[PDB]
Enzyme design. Structure first.
Site, PDB file in Angstrom:
ATOM      1  N   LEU A  22      -3.198  -2.631  -9.479  1.00  0.00           N
ATOM      2  CA  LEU A  22      -4.561  -2.053  -8.589  1.00  0.00           C
ATOM      3  C   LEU A  22      -4.521  -0.352  -8.913  1.00  0.00           C
ATOM      4  O   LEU A  22      -5.614   0.288  -9.562  1.00  0.00           O
ATOM      5  CB  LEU A  22      -5.204  -2.728  -7.527  1.00  0.00           C
ATOM      6  CG  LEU A  22      -5.116  -4.092  -6.843  1.00  0.00           C
ATOM      7  CD1 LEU A  22      -4.866  -3.899  -5.279  1.00  0.00           C
ATOM      8  CD2 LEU A  22      -6.333  -3.719  -7.014  1.00  0.00           C
ATOM      9  N   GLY A  23      -3.945  -0.608  -8.983  1.00  0.00           N
ATOM     10  CA  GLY A  23      -2.837   1.304  -9.201  1.00  0.00           C
ATOM     11  C   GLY A  23      -0.501   1.379  -8.520  1.00  0.00           C
ATOM     12  O   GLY A  23      -0.370   0.481  -8.553  1.00  0.00           O
ATOM     13  N   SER A  24      -0.512   2.401  -9.841  1.00  0.00           N
ATOM     14  CA  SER A  24       0.951   2.633  -9.290  1.00  0.00           C
ATOM     15  C   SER A  24       1.013   4.303  -9.360  1.00  0.00           C
ATOM     16  O   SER A  24       0.382   5.248  -9.797  1.00  0.00           O
ATOM     17  CB  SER A  24       1.324   2.497 -11.109  1.00  0.00           C
ATOM     18  OG  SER A  24       2.952   2.653 -10.500  1.00  0.00           O
ATOM     19  N   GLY A  25       2.431   4.406  -8.067  1.00  0.00           N
ATOM     20  CA  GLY A  25       2.933   5.918  -8.006  1.00  0.00           C
ATOM     21  C   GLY A  25       4.049   5.627  -7.649  1.00  0.00           C
ATOM     22  O   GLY A  25       5.040   5.020  -8.865  1.00  0.00           O
ATOM     23  N   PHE A  27       6.032   5.566  -4.965  1.00  0.00           N
ATOM     24  CA  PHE A  27       6.277   3.830  -4.702  1.00  0.00           C
ATOM     25  C   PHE A  27       7.090   3.343  -4.733  1.00  0.00           C
ATOM     26  O   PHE A  27       7.504   2.736  -4.955  1.00  0.00           O
ATOM     27  CB  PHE A  27       5.615   3.693  -3.058  1.00  0.00           C
ATOM     28  CG  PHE A  27       4.188   3.967  -3.988  1.00  0.00           C
ATOM     29  CD1 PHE A  27       4.141   2.618  -3.709  1.00  0.00           C
ATOM     30  CD2 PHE A  27       3.077   4.617  -3.978  1.00  0.00           C
ATOM     31  CE1 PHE A  27       2.808   2.101  -4.700  1.00  0.00           C
ATOM     32  CE2 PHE A  27       2.260   4.131  -4.908  1.00  0.00           C
ATOM     33  CZ  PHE A  27       1.751   2.668  -5.477  1.00  0.00           C
ATOM     34  N   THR A  29       4.775  -0.098  -7.253  1.00  0.00           N
ATOM     35  CA  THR A  29       3.068  -0.393  -7.296  1.00  0.00           C
ATOM     36  C   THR A  29       2.395  -1.393  -7.062  1.00  0.00           C
ATOM     37  O   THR A  29       3.476  -2.239  -6.564  1.00  0.00           O
ATOM     38  CB  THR A  29       3.431  -1.166  -9.392  1.00  0.00           C
ATOM     39  OG1 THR A  29       2.156  -1.585  -9.583  1.00  0.00           O
ATOM     40  CG2 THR A  29       4.464  -1.658  -9.086  1.00  0.00           C
ATOM     41  N   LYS A  49       2.497  -4.872  -2.467  1.00  0.00           N
ATOM     42  CA  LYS A  49       3.276  -3.318  -2.538  1.00  0.00           C
ATOM     43  C   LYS A  49       4.832  -3.981  -3.368  1.00  0.00           C
ATOM     44  O   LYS A  49       4.955  -4.373  -1.985  1.00  0.00           O
ATOM     45  CB  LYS A  49       3.230  -2.822  -1.535  1.00  0.00           C
ATOM     46  CG  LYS A  49       3.633  -1.644  -1.688  1.00  0.00           C
ATOM     47  CD  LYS A  49       3.231  -0.692  -0.470  1.00  0.00           C
ATOM     48  CE  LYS A  49       4.730   0.522  -0.134  1.00  0.00           C
ATOM     49  NZ  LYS A  49       4.071   1.687   0.691  1.00  0.00           N
ATOM     50  N   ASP A 138      -0.326  10.011   9.382  1.00  0.00           N
ATOM     51  CA  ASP A 138      -1.198   9.944   8.126  1.00  0.00           C
ATOM     52  C   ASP A 138      -2.787   9.666   8.394  1.00  0.00           C
ATOM     53  O   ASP A 138      -2.888   8.617   7.110  1.00  0.00           O
ATOM     54  CB  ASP A 138      -0.230  10.372   7.337  1.00  0.00           C
ATOM     55  CG  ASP A 138      -0.275  10.508   6.142  1.00  0.00           C
ATOM     56  OD1 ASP A 138       0.210   9.935   4.733  1.00  0.00           O
ATOM     57  OD2 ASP A 138      -0.698  11.256   5.549  1.00  0.00           O
ATOM     58  N   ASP A 156      -1.637   2.536   5.704  1.00  0.00           N
ATOM     59  CA  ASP A 156       0.093   3.339   5.736  1.00  0.00           C
ATOM     60  C   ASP A 156       0.624   4.252   6.929  1.00  0.00           C
ATOM     61  O   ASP A 156       0.313   4.978   7.513  1.00  0.00           O
ATOM     62  CB  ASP A 156      -0.550   4.562   4.561  1.00  0.00           C
ATOM     63  CG  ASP A 156       0.493   5.328   3.404  1.00  0.00           C
ATOM     64  OD1 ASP A 156       1.226   5.308   4.726  1.00  0.00           O
ATOM     65  OD2 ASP A 156       0.189   5.128   2.867  1.00  0.00           O
TER      66      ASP A 156
HETATM   67  C1  LIG Z   1       1.530   2.955  -1.655  1.00  0.00           C
HETATM   68  O1  LIG Z   1       1.025   2.821   0.016  1.00  0.00           O
HETATM   69  C2  LIG Z   1      -0.021   1.413   0.045  1.00  0.00           C
HETATM   70  C3  LIG Z   1       0.182   1.221   1.828  1.00  0.00           C
HETATM   71  C4  LIG Z   1      -0.780  -0.081   2.231  1.00  0.00           C
HETATM   72  N1  LIG Z   1      -1.864   0.433   1.581  1.00  0.00           N
HETATM   73  C5  LIG Z   1      -2.760  -1.379   1.958  1.00  0.00           C
HETATM   74  N2  LIG Z   1      -2.197  -2.044   3.402  1.00  0.00           N
HETATM   75  C6  LIG Z   1      -3.346  -2.655   3.786  1.00  0.00           C
HETATM   76  C7  LIG Z   1      -3.620  -3.882   2.521  1.00  0.00           C
HETATM   77  C8  LIG Z   1      -3.724  -2.598   1.339  1.00  0.00           C
HETATM   78  N3  LIG Z   1      -4.393  -3.785   0.803  1.00  0.00           N
HETATM   79  C9  LIG Z   1      -5.073  -2.719  -0.943  1.00  0.00           C
HETATM   80  C10 LIG Z   1      -5.039  -1.880  -1.332  1.00  0.00           C
HETATM   81  C11 LIG Z   1      -6.002  -1.108  -2.337  1.00  0.00           C
HETATM   82  C12 LIG Z   1      -6.992  -2.145  -2.460  1.00  0.00           C
HETATM   83  C13 LIG Z   1      -6.986  -3.282  -2.123  1.00  0.00           C
HETATM   84  N4  LIG Z   1      -6.268  -3.275  -1.772  1.00  0.00           N
HETATM   85  C14 LIG Z   1      -7.437  -1.828  -4.073  1.00  0.00           C
HETATM   86  C15 LIG Z   1      -6.694   0.213  -3.925  1.00  0.00           C
HETATM   87  C16 LIG Z   1      -7.515   0.475  -5.357  1.00  0.00           C
HETATM   88  C17 LIG Z   1      -7.593   0.816  -6.237  1.00  0.00           C
HETATM   89  N5  LIG Z   1      -7.817   1.880  -7.410  1.00  0.00           N
HETATM   90  N6  LIG Z   1      -6.876   2.075  -7.251  1.00  0.00           N
HETATM   91  C18 LIG Z   1      -6.212   1.776  -6.398  1.00  0.00           C
HETATM   92  N7  LIG Z   1      -5.687  -0.468  -3.585  1.00  0.00           N
HETATM   93  C19 LIG Z   1      -4.815   0.795  -3.070  1.00  0.00           C
HETATM   94  C20 LIG Z   1      -5.288   1.765  -1.593  1.00  0.00           C
HETATM   95  C21 LIG Z   1      -3.608   0.742  -3.781  1.00  0.00           C
HETATM   96  N8  LIG Z   1      -2.873  -1.677   0.711  1.00  0.00           N
HETATM   97  C22 LIG Z   1      -2.293   0.098   0.436  1.00  0.00           C
HETATM   98  C23 LIG Z   1      -1.009   1.662  -0.104  1.00  0.00           C
END
Ligand SMILES: COC1CCN(c2nccc(Nc3cc4c(cn3)cc(-c3cn[nH]c3)n4C(C)C)n2)CC1
Length: 299
Positions: A22-25, A27, A29, A49, A138, A156
């Protein structure tokens, strides 16, 4: 105080499948995946994650602790952890990503009802965290995820307890003081981010100037769609006296009254004629056969 009787679910690697990234940084992926428990005949859409350094594991296990300790319709819960060499957090898939990008990508179809409803939902999630005596540290539109355009959740917990300068209360920048009232300042900024359709707060200004700017009496401008009613709420979240700022229970009430007559509080050209995807749309939702959303999957 009260013993934290939350259950930390350890999941087998074999119990879930990573579909794509979905995305990489920095932290690591986040992957899009499916969780197929034991012999349950369910497919839960998930977000997984995932170098191994003892310090980075303590941080991810600290976020797992907080995330497993929450249960609210407007807060992202931890479904479980998988103990591989990498160590990964299994979370609910929020199909529409973060609210920040969502407002940027869909400004032409976002109406007053949606914006005000989002504010009510963030206030509810935040008031829940206050009940659980949790200080987010945050809150921002990037940390509010979209399950459906009509349902958003706070996420987060990497900073949550019991630096993002442009979202911080003055006591936080100057003294590192974090209260539920400092989360209210960030709530004000989050609302500003939504009402401007994803604008960067204090764009062009370096983070070091922010402290002095706020001390002078300067705040974020009134977005064009905002009536004085909605902007007055934003301003109250940005008072020097933290106790003067509204409480989240008051923000739920304020935005709910407004959400009953959205056009009186937000002026958007094309409002009401706008539409976003709903679970009542053709093909809104591989084998789609036994998929259940995490919110309906309980043990
Ligand atoms: C690195 O920090 C993580 C902290 C937890 N966070 C999270 N928490 C609960 C559910 C969840 N699901 C979750 C996270 C998602 C998507 C679907 N479902 C789609 C994207 C995305 C789309 N384009 N680029 C990215 N993302 C991101 C925020 C990672 N994601 C995702 C980011």
């Amino acid at each position: 105080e009260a013993p934290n009787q939350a259950l930390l679910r350890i999941l087998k690697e074999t119990e879930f499948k990573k579909i794509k990234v979905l995305g990489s940084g920095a932290f690591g992926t986040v992957y899009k995946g499916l969780w197929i428990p034991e012999g349950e005949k369910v497919k839960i859409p998930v977000a997984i994650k995932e170098a191994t350094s003892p310090k980075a594991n303590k941080e991810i296990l600290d976020e797992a602790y907080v995330m497993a300790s929450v249960d609210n319709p407007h807060v992202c819960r931890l479904l479980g952890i998988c103990l591989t060499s990498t160590v990964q957090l299994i979370m609910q898939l929020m199909p529409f990503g973060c609210l920040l990008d969502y407002v940027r990508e869909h400004k032409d179809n976002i109406g007053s009802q949606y914006l005000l409803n989002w504010c009510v939902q963030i206030a509810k999630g935040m008031n829940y965290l206050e009940d659980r005596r949790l200080v987010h540290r945050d809150l921002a539109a990037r940390n509010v995820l979209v399950k459906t355009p009509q349902h958003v959740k706070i996420t987060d917990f990497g900073r949550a307890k019991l630096v993002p300068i442009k979202w911080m209360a003055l006591e936080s920048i100057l003294h590192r003081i974090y209260t539920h009232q400092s989360d209210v300042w960030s709530y004000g900024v989050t609302v500003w981010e939504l009402m401007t359709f994803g604008s960067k707060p204090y764009d062009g200004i370096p983070a070091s100037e922010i402290s002095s700017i706020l001390e002078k009496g300067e705040r974020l401008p009134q977005p064009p769609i905002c009536t004085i009613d909605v902007y007055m709420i934003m301003v109250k979240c940005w008072m020097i006296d933290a106790d003067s700022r509204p409480k989240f229970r008051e923000l739920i009430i304020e935005f709910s009254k407004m959400a009953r007559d959205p056009q009186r509080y937000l002026v958007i050209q094309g409002d009401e004629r706008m539409h976003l995807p709903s679970p009542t749309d053709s093909n809104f939702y591989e084998d789609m056969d036994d998929v259940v959303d995490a919110d309906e999957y309980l043990i």
